[PDB]
Ligand binder design. Structure first.
Ligand SMILES: Cc1nc(C#N)c(N)o1
Length: 165
């Protein structure tokens, strides 16, 4: 199962890891993708997860969008986890660089409560432009299920752990 995680709360764990390598190792039931409403997995966590699936995640996602239309900011959909997980929960956190409402971050984390255990990144962090310290706070105050957070950046991981209240 999940190894080397630091326990933050009753249900939130954190590790300095590449979520792709973590998913390939653990093969979790659910890996969370830091998705956008169009499921265009170009960069950040989404680009990395999609590249690990040899673009199969993008092909599946394009068919999903053709059928259903775009997701809402704060929403999610469950698709295949391909070679990374049983399922991928594509969750859209607000993108601060596109001027989206940061208050939607709690709605985005609420999607995690539909899954007993997840491997996930910090929503709206990285190229989505939100403060990762704030994202971790919203995560711990919103998610009640077991969430294993993978933080790619070592310096950010250290800052997150050392400043955790
Ligand atoms: C290549 C890569 N970039 C990230 C991020 N963020 C990741 N998980 O893997």
């Amino acid at each position: 199962s999940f190894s080397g995680y630091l326990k933050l709360t009753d249900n939130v764990y954190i590790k300095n890891a590449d979520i792709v390598e973590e998913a390939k190792k653990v093969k979790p039931t659910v890996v969370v993708n830091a998705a956008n409403v169009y499921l265009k997995h170009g960069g950040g966590v989404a680009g990395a997860l999609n590249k690990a699936t040899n673009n199969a995640m993008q092909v599946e996602s394009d068919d999903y969008i053709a059928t259903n239309g775009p997701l809402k900011v704060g929403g999610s959909c469950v698709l295949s986890g391909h070679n990374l997980a049983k399922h991928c929960l594509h969750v859209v956190g607000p993108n601060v660089n596109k001027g989206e409402d940061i208050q939607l971050l709690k709605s985005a984390y609420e999607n995690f409560n539909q899954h007993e255990v997840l491997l996930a990144p910090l929503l709206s962090a990285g190229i989505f432009g939100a403060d990762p310290i704030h994202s971790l706070r919203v995560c711990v105050d919103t998610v009640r299920t077991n969430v294993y957070l993978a933080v790619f950046d070592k310096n950010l991981y250290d800052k997150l752990v050392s400043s955790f209240l």
